[PDB]
Design a protein around this ligand. Structure first.
Ligand SMILES: [Zn+2]
Ligand SMILES: [Zn+2]
Ligand SMILES: [Zn+2]
Ligand SMILES: [Zn+2]
Lengths: 135, 436, 44, 82, 44, 257, 49, 468, 67, 49, 114
RNA sequence: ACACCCAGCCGCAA
């Protein structure tokens, strides 16, 4: 999907910031070993990703559409929330992981597009404000 | 007849706490008109908040702005839940807050945030009065013995609400610091880190508090909420302005004068550039200048002259920037990012630079000469628009007239292109008005 | 500037009301030129 | 429609939040009964916001699907974004 | 009703709605004298 | 915990300028005494003017402003006359204000200079400062000026015509010792009038245990009040303001309890 | 056709963009001591409106 | 073959009064040359003899300390347009931001930039009808119809205002009543927000022989904190706040500044010539001679001015230590001080303020009228309604164009779509063309759209209201 | 127009010095020595006396409108 | 024309006024010079399109 | 036309009190003085004199707005010493301060005059 | 219980 190595990409909720918040709220120590089993992370990510709904349905067409729309956030989520990265540099705990999952669910549900929002006029105004700054 | 039974309507005067909406033509985007709260003040003007001047693209030099008062319980509520400036700090244009600290408070945060600033008890003593979200407990000072001194970073930590985590870099960040040692020490006190709502190191600037993606105010909006961000902005604009009331900011002649050694170096660089362009035009006169492939001989000659003069202006700007002292306010205004640029510093102090009209240099209005004072058939630096002097040293009338041409085209382009951008505006938004 | 009934073809902008806010403004308005243009080439 | 086969985002968005908070507060302004106990405030906006927090707003929202069929949602099953 | 003329300054009343004139100069510009009624001015 | 022990020394007591030095005093006290000098010292000045006839080219508002900002001597009776707002007298009375009568008429070829000497008062203890004289308006032949003016009591917060000082100068810590100012190039700055350094030294050495003290004043009257009684009037006004604050605070704390 | 026309006409200059009661316009002035949502209004405008 | 007579004759009338224009930026020179025409002051010496609309005159005009050799030849010395003002370039409080200024209320009370605003009106007995004539007379409460609630007792028996009296807003100022074809009050009224004083009134005969008069009303303008100000270098600014003398900073010698301009007006819009003006003004006011500031002079630069200032007992770069007005503590930085030339601009805060609340209404549009002189309302343009389309506030956008502007009720048939007649009292709703007396529906819809669709129906177009 | 009575910055008396300033200028004195002889040590009043142009002699060349 | 300072001041006319303006119905009107292409001169031009 | 008359900077009309006492709830043993119709002239004095007292933890002042002639002073002391009586002591030693300064200035004037 | 009709033009504000 991505050529030219353009690693900068826009995603709804900034994963590293919430991981750092979970580190500095529950006062965990990165020096000491943590108590967080890897499959807790595995099925936490798997059970989380089934509740990020964009295309809501049960038939395979809507399931494929939801996978297509959620794919970039899922493919970043599984990379950031990997077991080895958690065990080495994040060192989160169990209730820290549970708070992380609940609060990323809250942030993603907040960041969804609100129905009834006029996208066309907002888009024209947004794309047209830099028209007055090639002077 | 003044008895008020239930069900009547009374048209009261607009008391304080009411909700109104301000507008400034042209309304380019949805930040340009949005709701406020009414506060009743004397005199005969609208008095609005200072960092709010970046959404409405305005300046306090004669701008007159419109007011709209809703009269409905439907309308006041929907404006209170849609068009309030606390709820709409960030814009969906480029997912960055156009709500941004600007013009004075930013360059005062820069000087209040450094390591060297230290406040006595009588200074922190008054700076803690101007807060609104302060918990009422004086923090432990960073210095106790011999005398209690408070650094400004603890004060700005008291400003930062809740628990915000943020890592930005200062504008004058040395690129070699990250690769080598002292990566988390930062002897220049760059690498702004905010840890658990506590400012830890770094001097704040435009890249941290201004209208930038991932800035401190952006994270404050995305974590704490919308009301807390409004209190954050208000607390900054109170305490930083009232610290600046003591410490004071200015600009003058002493911020423009460079050293005599600096002036000698700039004159030597200008003389070397003039000698080099004389050499290349002498090579072009006797027909040894090989043309660049794909380029006209005149085109490649103009490209070589422009390259040489741009290298000269870059070198003289670098020398002028290196000659700046730490107390120079011209440097502080551009490292803070509040206003100005380093190119403006170079034009003020060292050299204004090469001046152009519609891309090319000054044309030949007369019989192949720019001015009657210069000799015919001249493509030299002074005869074609280059300004060897600076604003501080004064301009000769020829280069003054060339700068008049530059200012004239800089007025014409922004005076005629608003017809085009306003038509592009209307055309784009009339077709898109119904997409939802 | 021209006949009254031929105001469509008559050039306008001639003989403005004299500005008297400032002596400098008055001396500016006495000594003033204008172009018959309603493109940025003549403006330069 | 019935209770089943009811699809729409269950997060009550800001537009209908503003609409409900306007309409019900104007109903206080036209002397309607107030669904919540109040402690010494008179602004209809404040009590309407307080009972929107209390989630006791006695109106329902009829949402227009683009197909044409309506879909009715109340307030108490919609959850507040705030 | 009293009036004051242009140059020679004779307080020529009219009270008759005739065309304006005077028996001294007859210059046809007239001014009216400040009335005897009292007005106060703040020095602020 | 209590008040300290200030000392005063006077270096010059001429007829229109007073320089005094206040030592062993906090900075805020001296700053407030400086502020009261130009804002809250009572003085008699013209505020109510009534124009009867004005044929001058200088119209009514010019003359009203110029007469408002003419200084008036109030060396002894500024305390005796009460404020017009606090007077039980309606409108104005001689006990609450001073009446000025101005009548002048030019019938000569050369220009008549209507100065402050032509102002005539009722109380001899209030007069503009002529005992050069202040110009008001110049009149050609045949141009008259008749008016009546009333002089109230006020201080500088209402208007600048009630400001008794000419200009106050406030200096503390003359050669820089507490680093209250940071000089980028200390050799480029002239020494102060009260500096105590030689030509080689630029600034005093650092004093970490120091505190701002030894304030230098250069207060200067405008000729209305004497330059030595203005300080006494300022201190008396500050004392009466804080006594009023005492009374109001005591009333509030007995009302709450 | 000129009455129905665009700018300074009916449908663009009279109806879709129109004039409204209960509005004010005044030159604007700095104020640091107010909040972000707060704004200063002169007494004459608040009295007339 | 030829030599220049002097290099500084390049500039025009407006551009000559800017000193050190080479040290400025050309857009700022263009701006100040455009704003030099707006600088009030004395304009023509016989201003009291003349009378005309929108005339300004200032109390104390002063020739600039920093002057060029060419404004003396424009006779600018005789008729200046400003006051040399002690200016501290400082960020003192925060009310100077976005190029704004803080001024001295003590100085303003002393006549600093206080001015007089002369305005004049004129009316005629333009006789049109045989008996339809207007005569200058005091209107009686019952003999004429055009009544307001203004004070009609301020006039004399001639029908004109007495000079020297005080008039407030919405007052009769010339009393003329036209006779009905008993009479009708066609008198003129003083426009809102004036509170001026009448000064001089004349009567005369016009070109066509009948009576004709002019008045002149003057009002002093103490500078409120909205007034437009600029320097001679393109330093656009409005008055942010007026502090008293005890609140602003002050030098060691007791000098308090008049106008405080924000320091960030310098770096972006590069106006180093303003700083050079300030330095030369300090050295000229301290010396005694009037500063020579011709645009092109190699004998005058910043170094000689700096040395001349340093010889006289000040900082050689023009800085000066100021103390805080509130605290009394020394300001840590050293503020750049010195006199400079500012000007007062025509654009008034009192003339630009405007408020509207269901006032006068246009006869055609049934909408608010065209601006403050007519007591009309502000426009809410296309791009404004598009702002609500972006916001999503549909009912604010409805109230802004239908409920508050022009609400109107129409009656339309249900079988056809043509607007139908409706008698209110007798309740006989009947639609012509259908013989329908039972189906007419009330529709709330703007008067502008009704006049729109009636202009369409004048063009044989049928916009039908299919309400069903 | 006319000399103000007070300096705008401080408030030192200015109105009683214009005639003296012209008198000292007529007796072959320079502007600096004339300003020093009037006791104007501060430059704020020096610029008031120095930069003020008088217009009253231009305005008193006109016949008055009354008598 | 030809009047001195004293005759102009006696006549209630400003000596400082440069003149050069007409008076039509009491309103001061001034003619602004309007440029036009030079007569009787042969030119060359190149239209692009 | 919205210029306030100059006398409301220090006059009090009918409806407001000179001193109002608010008890702060964020921290124990705190007060919120709301001295009305003075300026920084009083507030700087109050702040300096209360910082001279050793057993006062927090005592500072600020102005909410330069237009509204109002200052607010927030005083917090130790939990054995009321802020109201701390204010009372800080004024009653200030009275002696100003009276002593007045007397010394009087005797300095008398000694300088022969 | 208010009074001033509109077109056109020009200058000017951000
Ligand atoms: Zn006569
Ligand atoms: Zn009395
Ligand atoms: Zn029908
Ligand atoms: Zn002075």
């Amino acid at each position: 999907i991505f050529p030219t190595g353009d690693s900068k990409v826009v995603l709804p909720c900034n994963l590293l910031r919430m991981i750092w918040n979970a580190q500095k709220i529950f006062h965990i120590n990165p020096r000491l070993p943590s108590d967080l089993h890897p499959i807790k992370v595995v099925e936490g990510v798997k059970e989380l990703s089934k509740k990020l709904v964009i295309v809501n349905g049960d038939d395979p067409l809507s399931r494929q559409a939801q996978e297509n729309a959620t794919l970039l956030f899922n493919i970043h989520l599984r990379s950031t929330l990997c077991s080895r990265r958690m065990a080495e540099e994040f060192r989160l705990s169990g209730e820290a992981f549970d708070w992380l999952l609940g609060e990323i669910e809250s942030k993603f549900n907040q960041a969804i597009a609100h129905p009834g929002e006029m996208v066309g006029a907002l888009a024209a105004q947004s794309l047209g404000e830099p028209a007055t700054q090639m002077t | 007849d003044l008895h008020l039974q239930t069900g009547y309507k009374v048209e009261r005067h607009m008391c304080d706490g009411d909700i109104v909406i301000f507008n400034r033509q042209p309304t380019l985007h949805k930040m340009s008109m949005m709701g406020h709260r009414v506060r009743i003040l004397p005199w005969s003007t609208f008095r609005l908040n200072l960092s709010v001047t970046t959404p409405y693209n305005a300046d306090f030099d004669g701008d007159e702005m419109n007011l709209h008062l809703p009269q409905s319980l439907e309308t006041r509520a929907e404006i209170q839940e849609l068009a309030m400036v606390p709820r709409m700090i960030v814009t969906p244009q480029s997912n960055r807050p156009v709500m941004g600290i600007v013009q004075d408070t930013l360059t005062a945060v820069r000087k209040f945030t450094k390591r060297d600033v230290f406040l006595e008890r009588g200074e922190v003593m008054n700076l803690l009065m101007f807060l609104s979200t302060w918990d009422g407990k004086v923090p432990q000072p960073a210095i106790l013995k011999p005398r209690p001194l408070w650094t400004g970073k603890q004060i700005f930590s008291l400003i930062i609400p809740g628990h915000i985590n943020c890592i930005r870099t200062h504008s004058t960040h040395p690129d070699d610091e990250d690769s080598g040692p002292y990566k988390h020490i930062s002897p220049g006190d760059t690498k702004v880190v905010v840890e658990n709502g506590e400012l830890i190191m770094g001097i704040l600037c435009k890249k941290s508090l201004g209208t930038s993606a991932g800035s401190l105010v952006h994270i404050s909006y995305l974590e704490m909420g919308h009301d807390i961000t409004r209190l954050f902005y208000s607390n900054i604009q109170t305490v930083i302005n009232n610290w600046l009331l003591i410490e004071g900011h200015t600009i003058g002649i002493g911020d423009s004068i460079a050293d005599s050694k600096t002036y000698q170096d700039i004159q030597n660089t200008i003389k070397k550039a003039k000698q080099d362009v004389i050499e290349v035009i002498e090579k072009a006169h006797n027909n040894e200048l090989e043309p660049t492939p794909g380029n006209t001989l005149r085109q490649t000659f103009e490209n070589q002259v422009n390259r040489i003069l741009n290298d000269a202006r870059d070198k003289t700007g670098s020398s002028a920037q290196k000659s700046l002292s730490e107390y120079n306010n011209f440097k502080s205004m551009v490292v803070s990012g509040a206003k100005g640029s380093k190119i403006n510093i170079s034009q003020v102090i060292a050299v204004v630079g090469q001046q152009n009209v519609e891309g090319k240099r000054i044309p030949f209005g007369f019989k192949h000469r720019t001015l009657p004072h210069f000799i015919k058939d001249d493509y030299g630096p002074e005869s074609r628009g280059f300004v060897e002097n600076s604003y501080l040293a004064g301009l000769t009338p020829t280069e003054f007239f060339f700068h008049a041409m530059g200012g004239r085209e800089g007025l014409i382009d922004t005076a005629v292109k608003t017809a085009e951008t306003g038509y592009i505006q209307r055309r784009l938004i009339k077709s898109m008005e119904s997409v939802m | 500037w021209g006949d009254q009934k031929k105001a469509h073809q008559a050039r306008a902008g001639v003989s403005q009301v004299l500005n008297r806010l400032t002596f400098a403004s008055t001396l500016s308005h006495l000594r003033r030129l204008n172009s018959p243009i309603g493109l940025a080439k003549p403006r330069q | 429609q019935a209770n089943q086969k009811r699809i729409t985002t269950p997060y009550m968005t800001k537009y209908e939040r503003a609409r409900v908070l306007g309409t019900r507060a104007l109903q206080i302004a036209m002397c309607a009964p107030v669904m919540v106990e109040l402690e010494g405030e008179t602004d209809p906006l404040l009590i309407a916001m307080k009972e929107l927090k209390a989630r006791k707003i006695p109106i329902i929202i009829r949402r227009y699907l683009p197909d044409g069929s309506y879909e009715d949602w109340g307030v108490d099953e919609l959850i507040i974004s705030d | 009703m009293i009036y004051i003329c242009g140059e020679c300054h004779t307080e020529n009343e009219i009270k008759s709605r005739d065309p304006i004139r005077c028996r001294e100069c007859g210059y046809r510009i007239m001014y009216k004298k400040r009335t005897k009624r009292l007005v106060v001015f703040d020095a602020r | 915990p209590y008040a300290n022990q200030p000392t005063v020394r006077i270096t010059e007591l001429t007829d229109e300028n007073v320089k005094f030095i206040i030592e062993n005093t906090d900075l805020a006290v001296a700053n407030s005494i400086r502020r009261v000098f130009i804002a809250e010292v009572p003085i008699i000045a013209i505020d109510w003017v009534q124009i009867d006839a004005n044929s001058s080219v200088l119209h009514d508002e010019f003359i009203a402003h110029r007469l408002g900002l003419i200084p008036l001597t109030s060396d002894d009776i500024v305390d005796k006359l009460q404020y017009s707002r606090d007077c039980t007298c309606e409108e104005f009375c001689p006990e609450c204000s001073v009446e000025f009568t101005l009548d002048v008429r030019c019938n000569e070829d050369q220009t008549r200079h209507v100065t402050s000497r032509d102002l005539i008062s009722n109380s001899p203890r209030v007069i503009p400062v002529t005992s050069d004289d202040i110009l008001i308006v110049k009149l050609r032949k045949g141009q008259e000026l008749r008016l009546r003016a009333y002089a109230k009591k006020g201080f500088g917060k209402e208007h600048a015509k009630w400001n008794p000082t000419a200009g106050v100068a406030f200096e503390y810590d003359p050669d820089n010792a507490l680093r209250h100012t940071v000089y980028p190039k200390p050799e480029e700055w002239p020494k102060s009038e009260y500096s105590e350094l030689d030509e080689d030294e630029s600034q005093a050495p650092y004093d970490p245990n120091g505190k701002p003290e030894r304030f230098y004043y250069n207060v200067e009257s405008c000729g209305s009040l004497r330059p030595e009684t203005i300080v006494l009037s300022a201190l008396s006004g500050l004392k009466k303001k804080l006594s009023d604050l005492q009374t109001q605070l005591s009333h509030e704390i007995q009302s709450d309890v | 056709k000129q009455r129905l026309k665009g700018k300074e006409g009916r449908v663009r200059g009279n109806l879709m963009g129109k004039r409204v009661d209960f509005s004010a316009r005044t030159v604007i002035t700095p104020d640091p001591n107010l909040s972000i949502d707060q704004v200063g209004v002169p007494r004459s405008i608040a009295a007339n409106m | 073959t030829h030599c220049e007579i002097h290099p500084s004759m390049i500039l025009g009338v407006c551009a000559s009064i800017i000193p050190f224009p080479d040290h400025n930026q050309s857009p700022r020179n263009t701006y100040q040359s455009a704003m030099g025409k707006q600088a009030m002051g004395v304009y023509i010496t016989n201003f009291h003899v003349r009378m005309d609309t929108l005339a300004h005159v200032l109390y104390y005009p002063q020739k600039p300390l920093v002057t060029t050799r060419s404004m003396e030849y424009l006779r600018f010395r005789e008729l200046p347009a400003g006051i040399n003002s002690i200016v501290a370039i400082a960020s003192y409080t925060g009310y100077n931001q976005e190029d704004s200024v803080i001024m001295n209320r003590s100085a303003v009370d002393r006549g600093f930039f206080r001015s007089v605003f002369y305005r004049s009106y004129k009316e005629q007995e333009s006789k049109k009808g045989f008996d339809q004539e207007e005569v200058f007379e005091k209107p009686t409460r019952e003999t004429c119809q055009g009544m307001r609630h203004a004070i009609y007792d301020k006039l004399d028996d001639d029908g004109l205002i007495a000079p020297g009296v005080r008039v407030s807003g919405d007052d009769v100022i010339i009393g003329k009543t036209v006779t009905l074809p008993t009479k009708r009050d066609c008198s003129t009224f003083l426009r809102t927000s004036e509170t001026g004083i009448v000064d001089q009134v004349m009567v005369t005969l016009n070109q066509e022989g009948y009576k004709f008069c002019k008045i002149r009303v003057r009002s002093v303008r103490i500078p409120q904190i909205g007034d437009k100000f600029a320097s001679r270098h393109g330093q656009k600014g409005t008055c942010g706040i007026q502090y008293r003398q005890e609140d602003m900073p002050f030098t060691c010698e007791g000098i308090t500044p008049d106008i405080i301009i924000n320091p960030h007006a310098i770096p972006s819009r590069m106006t180093i010539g303003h700083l050079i003006e300030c330095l030369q003004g300090k050295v000229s006011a301290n010396k005694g001679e009037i500063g020579d500031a011709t645009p092109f002079n190699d004998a005058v630069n910043v170094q000689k001015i700096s040395n001349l200032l340093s010889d006289y007992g000040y900082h050689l770069r023009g800085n000066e230590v100021l103390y805080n007005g509130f605290t009394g503590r020394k300001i840590t930085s050293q503020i750049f001080i010195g006199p400079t030339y500012y000007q007062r601009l025509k654009h008034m805060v009192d003339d630009k303020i405007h408020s509207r609340a269901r006032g006068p209404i246009q006869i055609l549009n049934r909408q608010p009228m065209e601006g403050r002189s007519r007591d009309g309302g502000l426009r809410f343009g296309e791009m404004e309604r598009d702002c609500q389309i972006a916001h999503g506030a549909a009912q604010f956008l409805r109230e802004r164009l239908f409920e508050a502007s022009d609400p109107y009720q129409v009656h339309v048939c249900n079988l056809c779509g043509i607007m139908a007649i409706a008698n209110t009292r007798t309740h006989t709703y009947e639609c012509r063309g259908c013989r329908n007396k039972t189906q007419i529906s009330l529709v709330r819809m703007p008067y502008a759209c009704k006049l729109l669709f009636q202009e369409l129906m004048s063009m044989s177009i049928a916009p039908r209201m299919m309400s069903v | 127009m006319i000399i103000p009575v007070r300096c705008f910055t401080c408030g030192k008396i200015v109105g009683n010095k214009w005639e003296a300033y012209l008198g000292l200028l007529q007796a072959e004195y320079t502007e600096g020595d004339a300003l020093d002889a009037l006791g104007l040590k501060r430059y704020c009043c020096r610029r008031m006396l120095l930069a003020h142009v008088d217009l009253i002699e231009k305005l008193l060349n006109y016949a008055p409108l009354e008598k | 024309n030809g009047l001195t300072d004293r005759d102009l001041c006696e006549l209630n006319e400003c000596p400082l006024d440069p003149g050069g303006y007409f008076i039509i119905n009491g309103s001061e009107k001034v003619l602004i010079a309007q440029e036009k292409m030079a007569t009787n001169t042969v030119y060359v031009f190149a239209k692009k399109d | 036309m919205n210029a306030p008359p100059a006398f409301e900077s220090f006059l009090l009309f009918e409806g407001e009190k000179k001193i109002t006492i608010n008890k702060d709830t964020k921290v124990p043993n705190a007060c919120l003085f709301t001295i009305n119709k003075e300026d920084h002239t009083l507030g700087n004095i109050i702040k300096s004199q209360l910082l001279k007292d050793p057993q006062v933890l927090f005592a500072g002042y600020k102005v909410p707005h330069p237009l509204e002639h109002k200052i607010i002073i927030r005083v917090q002391t130790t939990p054995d010493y009321s802020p109201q009586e701390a204010f009372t002591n800080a004024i009653t030693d200030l009275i002696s301060e100003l009276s002593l300064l007045e007397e010394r200035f009087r005797v300095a004037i008398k000694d300088k005059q022969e």
